[PDB]
Design an enzyme around this catalytic site. Sequence first.
Site, PDB file in Angstrom:
ATOM      1  CG  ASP B  36      -2.113  -1.052   0.930  1.00  0.00           C
ATOM      2  OD1 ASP B  36      -2.383  -1.387  -0.251  1.00  0.00           O
ATOM      3  OD2 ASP B  36      -2.684  -1.540   1.920  1.00  0.00           O
ATOM      4  CG  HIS B  66       3.835 -11.168 -12.557  1.00  0.00           C
ATOM      5  ND1 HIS B  66       4.036 -12.507 -12.619  1.00  0.00           N
ATOM      6  CD2 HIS B  66       5.086 -10.581 -12.577  1.00  0.00           C
ATOM      7  CE1 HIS B  66       5.354 -12.759 -12.665  1.00  0.00           C
ATOM      8  NE2 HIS B  66       5.999 -11.577 -12.653  1.00  0.00           N
ATOM      9  CG  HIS B 109       9.037  -4.760 -15.551  1.00  0.00           C
ATOM     10  ND1 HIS B 109       9.637  -4.890 -16.749  1.00  0.00           N
ATOM     11  CD2 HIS B 109       9.081  -6.009 -14.955  1.00  0.00           C
ATOM     12  CE1 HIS B 109      10.011  -6.162 -16.927  1.00  0.00           C
ATOM     13  NE2 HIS B 109       9.687  -6.844 -15.821  1.00  0.00           N
ATOM     14  CG  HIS B 132      13.069  -5.844 -15.497  1.00  0.00           C
ATOM     15  ND1 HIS B 132      13.406  -6.524 -16.614  1.00  0.00           N
ATOM     16  CD2 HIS B 132      12.730  -6.796 -14.542  1.00  0.00           C
ATOM     17  CE1 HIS B 132      13.310  -7.843 -16.371  1.00  0.00           C
ATOM     18  NE2 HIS B 132      12.896  -8.005 -15.109  1.00  0.00           N
ATOM     19  CG  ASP B 213       2.112 -14.249 -18.982  1.00  0.00           C
ATOM     20  OD1 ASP B 213       1.640 -13.315 -18.290  1.00  0.00           O
ATOM     21  OD2 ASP B 213       3.327 -14.331 -19.244  1.00  0.00           O
ATOM     22  NE  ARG B 246      12.170 -39.995  -6.867  1.00  0.00           N
ATOM     23  CZ  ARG B 246      11.139 -40.822  -6.744  1.00  0.00           C
ATOM     24  NH1 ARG B 246      10.109 -40.481  -5.978  1.00  0.00           N
ATOM     25  NH2 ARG B 246      11.160 -41.990  -7.348  1.00  0.00           N
ATOM     26  NE  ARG B 260      12.315 -18.379 -20.270  1.00  0.00           N
ATOM     27  CZ  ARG B 260      13.254 -18.130 -21.183  1.00  0.00           C
ATOM     28  NH1 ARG B 260      13.614 -19.063 -22.057  1.00  0.00           N
ATOM     29  NH2 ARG B 260      13.840 -16.942 -21.217  1.00  0.00           N
ATOM     30  NE  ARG B 345      -4.058  -4.574 -35.352  1.00  0.00           N
ATOM     31  CZ  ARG B 345      -3.910  -5.043 -34.120  1.00  0.00           C
ATOM     32  NH1 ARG B 345      -4.088  -4.242 -33.062  1.00  0.00           N
ATOM     33  NH2 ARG B 345      -3.558  -6.318 -33.945  1.00  0.00           N
TER      34      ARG B 345
HETATM   35  N1  LIG Z   1       4.301 -36.036 -14.682  1.00  0.00           N
HETATM   36  C1  LIG Z   1       3.182 -36.098 -13.935  1.00  0.00           C
HETATM   37  N2  LIG Z   1       2.279 -35.099 -13.830  1.00  0.00           N
HETATM   38  C2  LIG Z   1       1.179 -35.182 -13.068  1.00  0.00           C
HETATM   39  N3  LIG Z   1       0.888 -36.300 -12.374  1.00  0.00           N
HETATM   40  C3  LIG Z   1       1.697 -37.381 -12.421  1.00  0.00           C
HETATM   41  C4  LIG Z   1       2.905 -37.335 -13.211  1.00  0.00           C
HETATM   42  N4  LIG Z   1       3.517 -38.519 -13.068  1.00  0.00           N
HETATM   43  C5  LIG Z   1       2.765 -39.284 -12.223  1.00  0.00           C
HETATM   44  N5  LIG Z   1       1.669 -38.586 -11.851  1.00  0.00           N
HETATM   45  C6  LIG Z   1       0.593 -38.921 -10.911  1.00  0.00           C
HETATM   46  C7  LIG Z   1       0.209 -40.391 -10.821  1.00  0.00           C
HETATM   47  C8  LIG Z   1      -0.047 -40.581  -9.338  1.00  0.00           C
HETATM   48  O1  LIG Z   1      -1.420 -40.275  -9.063  1.00  0.00           O
HETATM   49  C9  LIG Z   1       0.794 -39.542  -8.639  1.00  0.00           C
HETATM   50  C10 LIG Z   1       2.103 -40.162  -8.169  1.00  0.00           C
HETATM   51  O2  LIG Z   1       2.808 -40.765  -9.246  1.00  0.00           O
HETATM   52  P1  LIG Z   1       4.378 -40.937  -9.216  1.00  0.00           P
HETATM   53  O3  LIG Z   1       4.971 -39.683  -8.645  1.00  0.00           O
HETATM   54  O4  LIG Z   1       4.827 -41.380 -10.566  1.00  0.00           O
HETATM   55  O5  LIG Z   1       4.531 -42.088  -8.099  1.00  0.00           O
HETATM   56  P2  LIG Z   1       5.246 -43.520  -8.155  1.00  0.00           P
HETATM   57  O6  LIG Z   1       4.677 -44.122  -6.931  1.00  0.00           O
HETATM   58  O7  LIG Z   1       4.887 -44.148  -9.436  1.00  0.00           O
HETATM   59  O8  LIG Z   1       6.829 -43.290  -8.120  1.00  0.00           O
HETATM   60  P3  LIG Z   1       7.753 -43.478  -6.815  1.00  0.00           P
HETATM   61  O9  LIG Z   1       7.234 -44.626  -6.014  1.00  0.00           O
HETATM   62  O10 LIG Z   1       9.091 -43.806  -7.389  1.00  0.00           O
HETATM   63  O11 LIG Z   1       7.795 -42.215  -6.014  1.00  0.00           O
HETATM   64  O12 LIG Z   1       1.090 -38.526  -9.607  1.00  0.00           O
HETATM   65 ZN   LIG Z   2       8.056 -11.331 -12.643  1.00  0.00          ZN
END
Ligand SMILES: Nc1ncnc2c1ncn2[C@H]1C[C@H](O)[C@@H](COP(=O)(O)OP(=O)(O)OP(=O)(O)O)O1
Ligand SMILES: [Zn+2]
EC number: 3.1.5.-
Lengths: 481, 493, 481, 493
Positions: B36, B66, B109, B132, B213, B246, B260, B345
């Site tokens: 604010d 944003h 910006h 920016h 976006d 992971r 992107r 235009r």
């Molecule tokens: N790329 C993704 N995007 C969105 N959802 C996903 C994707 N991959 C898997 N899922 C879903 C499926 C499941 O409902 C949930 C967990 O899946 P995942 O993370 O692949 O667990 P997993 O149990 O097969 O692997 P891990 O035991 O090795 O952790 O997410």
């Molecule tokens: Zn930004």
Amino acid sequence: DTMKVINDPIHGHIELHPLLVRIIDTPQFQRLRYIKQLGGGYYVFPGASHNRFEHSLGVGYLAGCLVHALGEKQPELQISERDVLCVQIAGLCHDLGHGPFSHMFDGRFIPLARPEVKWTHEQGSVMMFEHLINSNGIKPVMEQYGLIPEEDIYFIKEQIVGPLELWPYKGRPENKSFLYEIVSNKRNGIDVDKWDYFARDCHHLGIQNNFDYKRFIKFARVCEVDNELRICARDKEVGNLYDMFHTRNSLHRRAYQHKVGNIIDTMITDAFLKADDYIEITGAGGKKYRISTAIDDMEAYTKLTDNIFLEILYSTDPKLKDAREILKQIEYRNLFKYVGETQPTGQIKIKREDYESLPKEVASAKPKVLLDVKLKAEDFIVDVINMDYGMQEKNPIDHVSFYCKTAPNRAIRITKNQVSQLLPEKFAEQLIRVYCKKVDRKSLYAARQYFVQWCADRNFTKPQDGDVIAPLITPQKKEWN
Amino acid sequence: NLYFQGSQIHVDTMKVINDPIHGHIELHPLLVRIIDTPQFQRLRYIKQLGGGYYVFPGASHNRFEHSLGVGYLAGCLVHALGEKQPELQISERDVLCVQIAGLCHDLGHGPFSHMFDGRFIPLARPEVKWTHEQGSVMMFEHLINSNGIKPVMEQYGLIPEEDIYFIKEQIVGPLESLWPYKGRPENKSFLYEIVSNKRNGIDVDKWDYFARDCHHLGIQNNFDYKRFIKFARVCEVDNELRICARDKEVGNLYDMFHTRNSLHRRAYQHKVGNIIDTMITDAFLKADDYIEITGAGGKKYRISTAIDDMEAYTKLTDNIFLEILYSTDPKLKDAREILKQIEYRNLFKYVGETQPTGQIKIKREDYESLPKEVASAKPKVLLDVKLKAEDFIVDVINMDYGMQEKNPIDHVSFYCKTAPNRAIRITKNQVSQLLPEKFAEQLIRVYCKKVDRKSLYAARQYFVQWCADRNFTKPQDGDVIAPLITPQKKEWN
Amino acid sequence: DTMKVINDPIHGHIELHPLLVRIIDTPQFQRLRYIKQLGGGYYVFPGASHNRFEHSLGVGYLAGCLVHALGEKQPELQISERDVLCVQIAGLCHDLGHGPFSHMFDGRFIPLARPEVKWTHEQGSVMMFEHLINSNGIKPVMEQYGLIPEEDIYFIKEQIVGPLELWPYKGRPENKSFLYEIVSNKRNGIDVDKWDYFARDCHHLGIQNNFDYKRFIKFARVCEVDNELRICARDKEVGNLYDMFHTRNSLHRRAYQHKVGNIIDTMITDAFLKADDYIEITGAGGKKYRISTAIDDMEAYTKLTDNIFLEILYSTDPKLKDAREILKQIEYRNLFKYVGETQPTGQIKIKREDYESLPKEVASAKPKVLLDVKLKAEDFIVDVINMDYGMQEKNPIDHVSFYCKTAPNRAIRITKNQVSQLLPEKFAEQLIRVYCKKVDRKSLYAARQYFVQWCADRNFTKPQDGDVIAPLITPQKKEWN
Amino acid sequence: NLYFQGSQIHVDTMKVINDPIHGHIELHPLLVRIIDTPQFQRLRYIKQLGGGYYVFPGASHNRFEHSLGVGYLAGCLVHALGEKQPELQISERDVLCVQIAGLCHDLGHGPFSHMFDGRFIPLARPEVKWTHEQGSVMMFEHLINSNGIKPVMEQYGLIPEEDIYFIKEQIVGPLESLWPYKGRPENKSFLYEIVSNKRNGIDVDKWDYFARDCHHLGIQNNFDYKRFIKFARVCEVDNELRICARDKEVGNLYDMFHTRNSLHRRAYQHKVGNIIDTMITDAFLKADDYIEITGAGGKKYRISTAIDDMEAYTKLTDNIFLEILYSTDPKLKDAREILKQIEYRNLFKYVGETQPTGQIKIKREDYESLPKEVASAKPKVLLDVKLKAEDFIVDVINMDYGMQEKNPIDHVSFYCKTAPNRAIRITKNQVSQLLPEKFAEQLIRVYCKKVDRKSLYAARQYFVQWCADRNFTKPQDGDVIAPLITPQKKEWN
Ligand SMILES: Nc1ncnc2c1ncn2[C@H]1C[C@H](O)[C@@H](COP(=O)(O)OP(=O)(O)OP(=O)(O)O)O1
Ligand SMILES: [Zn+2]
Ligand SMILES: Nc1nc2c(ncn2[C@H]2C[C@H](O)[C@@H](COP(=O)(O)OP(=O)(O)OP(=O)(O)O)O2)c(=O)[nH]1
Ligand SMILES: Nc1ncnc2c1ncn2[C@H]1C[C@H](O)[C@@H](COP(=O)(O)OP(=O)(O)OP(=O)(O)O)O1
Ligand SMILES: [Mg+2]
Ligand SMILES: [Mg+2]
Ligand SMILES: [Mg+2]
Ligand SMILES: [Mg+2]
Ligand SMILES: [Zn+2]
Ligand SMILES: [Zn+2]
Ligand SMILES: [Zn+2]
């Protein structure tokens, strides 16, 4: 010149006939990029950055959608490409007359600045449309594409503002009456303008839309009523139509009449009033206009948009200091304080000629409490909000024609009791909000006592926080417990 | 009012804001005090996508919303990491600092966003080094000092001298030229990976703008940031504690950068959006000598010099477009004329797109020489008109994965299920043979400022001839736009 | 064993504590993959393929969400990880007792097959939960994770079905009363079960959800009421809560009580009744059960899912031919014919002990019309639908506690008139649908005359298509014109 | 009732269906007659994504609603093309024929969809050549004949002998082994590009499943089919009239196949979804000799032989899973035991994933030999257990852009703005240097049927050793799962 496709987040890919493109690519139309649909609402709902421009494209699109659908299902109606274009043009142009911050301008500012003028944005749309046509040589382009400018311009204007003066329209005869029910439906309020804004405002506000306009279109037909061919909805869609008006009322409750959105609109209006003598806007023949007088000259009005807010905010002119200070208070979020909300009890309506006497009444109330400060009529704002189904006291569904499965070409009526017993008992009410301009802890406590006492005196409903804010006031009223 | 452990509790009332992207966002009172102010509220008047709104009518959104979103997500990610790993000792102080950096990262910006630091400032003032991000640091310092924020910071447990420095580092990176940060030490390195990740570009800024976006443009987002957050941890890497994803998320991270690049291709680098930015930039250049913006001590600034004074820059927003358009001053007529042509235009005409071949790269120092080259082409075509260098615009677009030629996934740390505290690396060939072979390219767009049918026909010939001469790639419509030229280039068929 | 993350289209990535995973990965829980949430609704709304399994995951998730939120905002409540797990488990397991096609089974089938039993799915959930615990050795796993099985199993059961027998609960004391308002709120119906199903059913049905549960959670607190700590909503959220019940009513109107969805549920129920003597389901100790008796043995009931529909459809047993024929008629879309809908007028309620006498009444009506056929009581189906706000005649909002901005820890009440005058006058009504089993052109025309005549005789409301379907009947009634 | 031009009009009452993906879909009465049959309604009982539902709980959707969607979009695209180009002479007859092909293209799917023709039938009956598409043709013929559809077709202007043949061709391709189609001639070639596009894979089947699978899975769709439809036209190409896309849509088409590959990576080929399909397949194999399904003339069929009799196949759906699970027959005990292990989530354990290196491809004839190879690896690790070929599952997944090694965009025809009736080609290098260098690859997943901690540790060693031996790519978790093996392979570091 070819058609263009525009990607819209609400409607997807909208096709625009080259005649529509010519109308859109003018200063009079592009102006709508600079006027926020929800005005001060953006200061409460940060997603509501959307402008009248994209809303107008959507209304144009939907108007064409509905007319095409009716034509495809009922070839006997003789809807022509010319008719479709005229309806699209009316949809595109219906909001050309909006001013800075939309509703705020014709709803709050103009009535305060110039109480004697008759001004509505719809009137402004007709005047701006005329200005757009004349300033951009549109009539020959209309001719090239099969339109009859004299008849069709009149028709477009009628679709926007209603009769310009028995069948009251001249642009189209009674066997094309349904065409007047598309862009701005004066009969029952069911129009494509609402359909776009429900969908678009919801997208931006972050509230979900529960009305399905595409379903309505699928079930819409044209039926004979009296000597006219009118839009008729399938009978079992009646519940959906009641819910459409419910949806409209919820959007007003949640968003458009948000207590803080309204106070921001009020403060902006105040700044515009304080700036109005000193801002110059150049019109036709170099004549100079004010914020409040630009409505008299479409060349000047073309240059009057939300930009005026920043012109005031960024100004250094000492004559603009009072206006500038109010906008600066908005930025720092030093807003007038909400005191509360109430409603008239019984069948009492508050008349519009009485609004200005209400802050006086609140200040003239006599709370039997240890008051550390005295507040005056000028310390109070009293905002009266009329919430209805778009037709004052009337039920709009009583003005809808329906058809049944086994006779799709026969119009019938459906009454409220034939539908549900859980529907509204009446179709209009008033909300009264009170705010205090004095924002300190002691003035606010005082403001609360005056307010609740006033509610008691007037036999208005008990404020929801009544016992917490004014505990020494609520017991006096036994009607409240 | 109320007491706890025998002591009055100063309850922090949170404001709630409903955002269409993130839903209900809670704002700590310190964040509210920062929001604010005129320096923050300014962002309501600067469109995120600048000229893009003139091609995508849904893209009305501004930097303000944003910025709230980035503040929100920054807090989300830091909170998630701290709840999963209490051993990191993430404090409410740290959380507020990351939220503040997220809120304020875009304070610098200017008008029409990218257009301002990407196009206008480099042309108006070629010797200044302005970004920016630099503007955000300066504006943040100005916001803090003009609004008495330091006591408020202390009230909520911040140490302003340390924390302001930390916030600035989050936004712009190291504040000098070993561990390069002073705001926080190596065991909190991951905190610098949240708002603006200089190591690999995986940050919450991208997450908000992808979602927001897309919502406004009418294109759908395919990246799931909430999933990434669920799978993010902190791992020791080279004497730092850094964010680690992971292992099996690697495909999703390649897809994040693919998203992107798709958003740049579809929307941000849209040929017409870019030419509109170019025309607005041209108007601003024409107006620059004649606009006065009052700064501190009543000093007057230009559009291009307002960046040197934050009081003046506070008042420089997209409003400058309408100030020019609505102007009556004859000195502003040329600028005003350009904006009027946008409204009608009557835009510069797009001629086409090409790319370099081989590993040839167009150098930045050579961009200025390109319209001359196009105009010096000699198409064997009978034409009604002759075009000069000034009639051509050549826009060179660098498209990459955020780290020039480099693969950002090579700079991501991963962990595996059976050892969540141990950082590993995953190479491209361990993932898929269908991924990009390189990570940067250049797109070359050509436009003509002469818009009549005869001039455009001619521009098409000069353009395709130039492409042939330079051994650039065959324009996609080459067969149709230049049938007298295209069939004669043997490497195009 | 670690937690698992599940990607759900409604809620996104849901984290499941390993104790929850152990409960989910059992035959008693996985069974819910084979029971459609909306039963016969899928035969009208093809997106409504969703099963009770994924709904149950979502309810588990939201129950944990709400309890965690309350705990984070009010540490003084002493909500423990143990409490969160118990609430999640109740959310996961609240629907374990559903049978084939969900509502159809306990709402239509069981009352017809075995009129003397007291059966509700909620009772079934408790019994199935007990069976799940005992058959899968869950008690030691509960202990490992800090739970007290004796107390906590009881607590979970109480959350699902209510008091199992002054503070009427034993699982938790009065200072944790709010925990009983999460999964199944008997006080006012505001619970996470509704929040999941609004969102999930809408996703699949293709109707949009207008209720924002995440907003409710943000504004939810715990306040003292009497000697209890109860959930309290912010005062100005009252409008949203009225709209939540409106939303529930609209979903019933549009989808759950769809006239054809209901007739399909009716036909399936008929086939189950005709199959009930002949289908054998093996329970504990190898004992054999019927569709209607599997509810008495959880081992048998575990194997009773939507699969029974296909077992009947695919059968060759001549004893199953009558049942099979009814399902075959569904496949060919030879359904009973909708004749119409009506409502009682005045304050008349139709009593549940009178439902079975209604087809007789319709057949016994005397339409003064040239009838080409005579229809009998067995030719008619009369479906009576009770539509309310979840508490019969009562207003649920009268049972909600609110708090105000300036005293977040003080519960207050808000009355209907303090809110809006456009809200329902009453909170329960009845819809009466009539169908004819004889589907030819002449039987249907006849059915219409009997129906409308019956409406006249009973002083029920005029059917919306009344004049089109029964033109020689509607004039006789002057109350209708 | 009513008359027009002096003649009673037989008004075709359309049924409307509300679909969550497409909204309100209108169905012509002829389509309704086809839908309301046991052969069509069957698709309500077959999950689109089969075992995928056991990993993604939102994926409860069945082939029925997908099929309505494909019918709808097929009609949408043909209608759009005809309205833009009346010269194509697209008739309501043609439109109905394309809608019918869209409605019926998946009639031949069996229990759990892909699992049935992809895994089960090849193992149960190795010498039959069965595809679901072949099944759709047979089921459609059966549907037509068992429900008296031919008169209804004639009533609405169809010529059944021509049109049934055309519909079958749309579904399965040429019905024999010049112009290969009899249903329609070359000036209507584009009609064969709608439901199942054998030329380049751009069809409405993909469009529905992208949108619908994403809706249910909880992953977002980034392809915009409605945009494609807006930009689609028909162009003359090699004596045919074919679908042609606007040139500038080429990036979006590359992204369409990228989306398809992402959906396979995230969901359809999910390692656990695949192992669940594998276990269900194993149960079906174990049950196959003991399940009887009554077909025509009261003949009895097995799960694997029901494909030979459409009356029996009509009754073969996902219900077979529950028939096995609920069974009491001692002959079904082994099958039943496998399904019970799924319910308890005692699944085969995932060991890892690798890929071939170089241009080495694993041949289909060699898949069967792979578990033997893994079991024959000799990890230099001290282990408690020894694993044999029968303890390993090796699942080889072919990931491509739908045309083996080939780039499908090389088989797309484009048009340019200034000549919309002229077909052109666009090459990969005319688009972007960031696109895939190849268009097919193989993923190799390994699982262990022994699920205890000691056996899984051992399986990890056999697996990584095998990867090293075969010079496959380093498994992503290799450093963590096999520290005694991974550091010893010099090309992995
Ligand atoms: N790329 C993704 N995007 C969105 N959802 C996903 C994707 N991959 C898997 N899922 C879903 C499926 C499941 O409902 C949930 C967990 O899946 P995942 O993370 O692949 O667990 P997993 O149990 O097969 O692997 P891990 O035991 O090795 O952790 O997410
Ligand atoms: Zn930004
Ligand atoms: N989704 C949704 N959002 C709302 C509703 N009402 C307001 N909002 C939005 C607007 C703001 O962005 C945010 C907070 O608004 P509130 O009305 O709750 O806050 P306000 O400050 O006006 O009230 P307060 O000071 O707490 O009395 O939520 C609603 O009913 N639904
Ligand atoms: N890939 C895309 N996906 C979705 N929308 C897009 C995409 N590309 C552009 N748009 C939007 C921006 C505009 O609102 C609309 C039309 O843009 P576009 O088709 O690029 O027209 P154009 O006018 O720039 O090219 P042209 O004149 O050559 O046909 O679609
Ligand atoms: Mg264009
Ligand atoms: Mg507030
Ligand atoms: Mg797992
Ligand atoms: Mg019907
Ligand atoms: Zn409007
Ligand atoms: Zn439930
Ligand atoms: Zn398909």
